[PDB]
Amino acid sequence: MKSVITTVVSAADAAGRFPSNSDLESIQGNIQRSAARLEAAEKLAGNHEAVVKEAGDACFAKYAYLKNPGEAGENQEKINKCYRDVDHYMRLVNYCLVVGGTGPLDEWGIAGAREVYRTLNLPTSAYVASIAYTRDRLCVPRDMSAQAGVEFSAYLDYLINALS
């Protein structure tokens, strides 16, 4: 969807012209950044249900009020729904790491998020707490390389900005 290639083809198509020299000049930027983002993608993929385990609980540590009766988490199955809800965001961030743009984020998790969580009484603050706790726990020796963490954190704080 909203990738690097699908802006330069849609601009040339809306102008109604051939793929010009600046248009293939921008696909060269993929060759230098894919080596950084694809290795971030599968270090995310091979470790993925760990960072729902050690980070989906941080919202409940920050917001223990929503385990009360009459709240967003009543029983255990709603907590399972919460872990499923945040695992979906972790999957979409992996999809945007491989695409090269924020294409899979917008229409799959972001577009429409404002109404559901308002209508179903889900607080976005508990979402961005769990996302931000995953953001600041990144470091160069253990987690990934120096350039993987950069846009891995950039795709995270994009979601943080869009949810707020």
Binding site: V9, D13, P19, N30, L38, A41, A45, V98, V99
Partner: protein
Amino acid sequence: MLDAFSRVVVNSDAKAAYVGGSDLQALKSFIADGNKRLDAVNSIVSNASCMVSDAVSGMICENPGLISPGGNCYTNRRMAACLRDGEIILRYVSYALLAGDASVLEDRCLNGLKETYIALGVPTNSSIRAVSIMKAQAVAFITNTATERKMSFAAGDCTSLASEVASYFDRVGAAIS
């Protein structure tokens, strides 16, 4: 529309699967021959006017019934129409070659093209020949074996991309058939 990187996420989204290191090497290979695809698209769009004017005249000079009155390429306006009717085809195959898959020409150019040429009275088998000549010229160009004009390249193989632009050109044949 959809590029080659975005083709695998809509396949992995159908199973709710993370894209992992088991299918990433097919993408990294696609990135590794980025310059080969890139110079090939450039070699297509460099000589694109003779590519169109040669193909339409070659389609004419084998079937000279279109030039006769009552032909579909008879008058001056209809020849101006046909010279662009295939230039758009080349313009969208150049998009599909750069994007890495045949999604950008299938719903934009090819969707609804059949009944357009049926309702106007365009002979489909003549347009089949006209795009086959363009396919032959394409594999002549991006393999650098055009006997008519040579371009300089770094040495290596390019047939993997030459079969790609061949598989784009029969989709334009099938959608009009």
